[PDB]
Amino acid sequence: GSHMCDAFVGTWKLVSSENFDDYMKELGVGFATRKVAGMAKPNTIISVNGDVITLKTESTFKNTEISFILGQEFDEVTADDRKVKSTITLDGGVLVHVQKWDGKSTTLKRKREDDKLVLELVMKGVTCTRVYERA
Numbered sequence: 001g002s003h004m005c006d007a008f009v010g011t012w013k014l015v016s017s018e019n020f021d022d023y024m025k026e027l028g029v030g031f032a033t034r035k036v037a038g039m040a041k042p043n044t045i046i047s048v049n050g051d052v053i054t055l056k057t058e059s060t061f062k063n064t065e066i067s068f069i070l071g072q073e074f075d076e077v078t079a080d081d082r083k084v085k086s087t088i089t090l091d092g093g094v095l096v097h098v099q100k101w102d103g104k105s106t107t108l109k110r111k112r113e114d115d116k117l118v119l120e121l122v123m124k125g126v127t128c129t130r131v132y133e134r135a
């Protein structure tokens with residue numbers, strides 16, 4: 001049967017970024033990591049099996065995979081090596097991903113817009129946009 005998350009399922013390749021260096025800086029990412037991460041064009045497979053959503057990313061920099069159930073907090077190690085407590089929820093048709101660590105929080109929103117998957121990343125005053133197309 002069909003589900004709301006269906007529009008996210010697929011293979012997505014990064015095409016563009018706005019304010020990513022600023023966002024990483026706000027997170028405390030060091031110079032060299034910012035430069036190397038900022039060059040990459042990662043690919044992410046988003047799949048669903050029952051209630052479990054998996055996000056599998058492959059790139060020249062880091063490979064990551066997370067699996068989760070909507071609304072259920074989980075442990076995540078981010079590409080910049082933060083050890084966070086994450087929760088991913090649907091807000092209408094937007095996936096909202098909150099990461100908490102050391103009393104800090106960042107919010108990552110995934111939305112479908114035209115044929116794209118658009119990510120909005122917010123840390124304190126900084127907003128970054130990452131745009132993906134199907135691969």
Ligand SMILES: O=C(O)c1c(N2CCCCC2)nc2c(Cl)cc(Cl)cc2c1-c1ccccc1
Pocket residue numbers: 024027029033034037038040041042057059060061062063078079080108119121
């Ligand atoms: O796009 C990502 O998967 C991703 C990412 N994103 C954040 C939004 C949701 C998906 C994961 N956040 C990053 C951060 Cl906060 C720091 C660094 Cl140093 C690298 C990344 C990368 C990243 C960047 C380049 C290659 C691999 C992962």
